[PDB]
Design an enzyme around this catalytic site. Structure first.
Site: not given
Ligand SMILES: CCCCCOc1ccc(S(N)(=O)=O)cc1
Ligand SMILES: [Zn+2]
Ligand SMILES: CCCCCOc1ccc(S(N)(=O)=O)cc1
Ligand code: NA
Ligand code: NA
Length: 257
Positions: A61, A91, A93, A103, A116, A195-196
């Site tokens: 992703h 990470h 996007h 985003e 992020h 956001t995922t």
């Molecule tokens: C319990 C889920 C763990 C895997 C997902 O963790 C994340 C997913 C999105 C973001 S974000 N794009 O909003 O920065 C940060 C961390």
């Molecule tokens: Zn992110």
């Protein structure tokens, strides 16, 4: 499984993650004229001098740079936050073209990419417990525009060849995330979500006003990554962003006048 294609992308996520239509989803458009300066907001305290990066992973992703979060090392404090939040990973996007990829948007403007830096509230003990709380996470978001190269990003760019496909990782020690910040720590803040998927509503978002500049060559290398695993049909890792979501009953607050 969810992704960013026409068949499994953001318009489909609500079927397996109904919170996608929740009351505090991210990202959002930041309307700069209606975000109100809040003089009670404190300066952001970013303490990354003791950060211990470990590894970089293509998770299908994006790519994540992971940190040793078994101790108070790299932490985010202050700003809108109460207490201490530990850095676990960062990470990005990004888009297929320089005119999209972020985003969050600013007065509807899309940046080429968005960084992020993900942190969890130490009063919950582990990231897994933090994501069961409405104040479990703080994500520091930083926009990328295409211009001059970002020297502190080049070590990331130059490892990407080794993690081309989903599930590949590489040792990635001694990376200093201070090299990814802009000069100013002016910010906007609002309550939101991952956001995922799973789209959990745990995040205090802190979005810096000043973008960092990266070169066209740097972001082009991001776009050579693959969503697919090795041996599978090649699908370039581009346009891995969720569009802006309804603001609903929220306000965005500015740290600066
Ligand atoms: C319990 C889920 C763990 C895997 C997902 O963790 C994340 C997913 C999105 C973001 S974000 N794009 O909003 O920065 C940060 C961390
Ligand atoms: Zn992110
Ligand atoms: C298989 O096909 C799928 C699987 C998951 C999703 S979803 N709701 O996780 O985006 C969409 C389509
Ligand atoms: Na407002
Ligand atoms: Na430890």
């Amino acid at each position: 499984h969810w992704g960013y294609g026409k068949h499994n992308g953001p318009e489909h996520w609500h079927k397996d993650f109904p919170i996608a239509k929740g009351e505090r989803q991210s990202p959002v458009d930041i309307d700069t004229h209606t975000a109100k300066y809040d003089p009670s907001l404190k300066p952001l305290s970013v303490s990354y001098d003791q950060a211990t990066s470990l590894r970089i992973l293509n998770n299908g992703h994006a790519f994540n740079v992971e940190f040793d979060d078994s101790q108070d090392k790299a932490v985010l404090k202050g700003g809108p936050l109460d207490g201490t939040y530990r850095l676990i990973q960062f990470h990005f996007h990004w888009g297929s073209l320089d005119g999209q990829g972020s985003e969050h948007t600013v007065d509807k403007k899309k940046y080429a990419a968005e960084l992020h830096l993900v942190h969890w509230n130490t009063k919950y003990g582990d990231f897994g417990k933090a994501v069961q709380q409405p104040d479990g996470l703080a994500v520091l978001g930083i926009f990328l525009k295409v211009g001059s190269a970002k020297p502190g990003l080049q070590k990331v760019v130059d490892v990407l060849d080794s993690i081309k496909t989903k599930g590949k990782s590489a040792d990635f020690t001694n990376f200093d995330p201070r090299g990814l910040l802009p000069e100013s720590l002016d910010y906007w803040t609002y309550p939101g979500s991952l956001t995922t998927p799973p789209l959990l509503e745990c995040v205090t978002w802190i979005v810096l006003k000043e973008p960092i500049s990266v070169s066209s060559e740097q972001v082009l290398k991001f776009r050579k990554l693959n969503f697919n695993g090795e041996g599978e049909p090649e699908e370039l890792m581009v346009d891995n962003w969720r569009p802006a979501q309804p603001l609903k009953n929220r306000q965005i607050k500015a740290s600066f006048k």
